[PDB]
Amino acid sequence: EVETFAFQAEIAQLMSLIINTFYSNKEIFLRELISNSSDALDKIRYESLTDPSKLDSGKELHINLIPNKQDRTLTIVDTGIGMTKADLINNLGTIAKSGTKAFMEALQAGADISMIGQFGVGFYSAYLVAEKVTVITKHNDDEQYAWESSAGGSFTVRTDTGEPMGRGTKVILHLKEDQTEYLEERRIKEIVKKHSQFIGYPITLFVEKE
Ligand SMILES: NC(=O)c1ccc(O)cc1O
Ligand SMILES: [Cl-]
């Protein structure tokens, strides 16, 4: 069924800082998540160079952006390497304790929240715009898992019996009520063009039934 875990104290503090700090430039969350997708896609590509069978779970390396105004969700889907259960529990495959230290040492040496990705913890920028984040992931040779957190110091992990993914990671942002601009096609397109114009994988922005 469902396992509930406490965030490490430093990660809880990172999340509080992101949620509570007054900071208007919230759109960098999308750059940060697309960058994490690109890094995951680079990892499966590198493994495939010496073991082509690594791509038996899907040959196409890409990123989909899926807005849903009914559900108030923005979903970022990649076909990258995915995460094991251990990776999910260990801060979504990050060195988040040491990265959070460096980041907060930078925020005192002048830096701003937009530089979060330089510290390896850009996933947590999702909480600039999301009240809840759900991560569905599938790594070769492991099962499909669902991570979830509304912050407040805990996350859950369960085996996902939802729609099978093949391989990769899906980040489902349940947007805050005042952050629905990130479901509008023109706003998403503007952000991708501004901050993600050189990413080396196709980024397909899905459209909705009007
Ligand atoms: N390593 C991963 O699978 C991964 C983690 C976080 C994220 O936002 C995207 C990802 O592909
Ligand atoms: Cl660490």
Swiss-Prot record:
PTM characteristics: ISGylated.
Residue intervals passing through the bilayer: none
Outcome reported for the amino acid change (mutating E32A): Strong ATP-binding. Strong interaction with HSF1, HIF1A, ERBB2, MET, KEAP1 and RHOBTB2. No effect on interaction with TSC1
Subunit: Homodimer. Identified in NR3C1/GCR steroid receptor-chaperone complexes formed at least by NR3C1, HSP90AA1 and a variety of proteins containing TPR repeats such as FKBP4, FKBP5, PPID, PPP5C or STIP1. Forms a complex containing HSP90AA1, TSC1 and TSC2; TSC1 is required to recruit TCS2 to the complex. The closed form interacts (via the middle domain and TPR repeat-binding motif) with co-chaperone TSC1 (via C-terminus). Interacts with TOM34. Interacts with TERT; the interaction, together with PTGES3, is required for correct assembly and stabilization of the TERT holoenzyme complex.
Residues where N6-acetyllysine is found: K43, K69
Localization in the cell: Nucleus; Cytoplasm; Melanosome; Cell membrane
Primary role: Molecular chaperone that promotes the maturation, structural maintenance and proper regulation of specific target proteins involved for instance in cell cycle control and signal transduction. Undergoes a functional cycle that is linked to its ATPase activity which is essential for its chaperone activity. This cycle probably induces conformational changes in the client proteins, thereby causing their activation. Interacts dynamically with various co-chaperones that modulate its substrate recognition, ATPase cycle and chaperone function.
Family under the similarity heading: Belongs to the heat shock protein 90 family.
Domain notes: The TPR repeat-binding motif mediates interaction with TPR repeat-containing proteins like the co-chaperone STUB1.
Span within the parent record: 16 to 225 of 732
Record: residues binding ATP: N36, D78, K97, F123
Region listing for Interaction with NR3C1, in residue ranges: 1-210
Disulfide bridge partners, by residue number: none
Name of the featured protein: Heat shock protein HSP 90-alpha
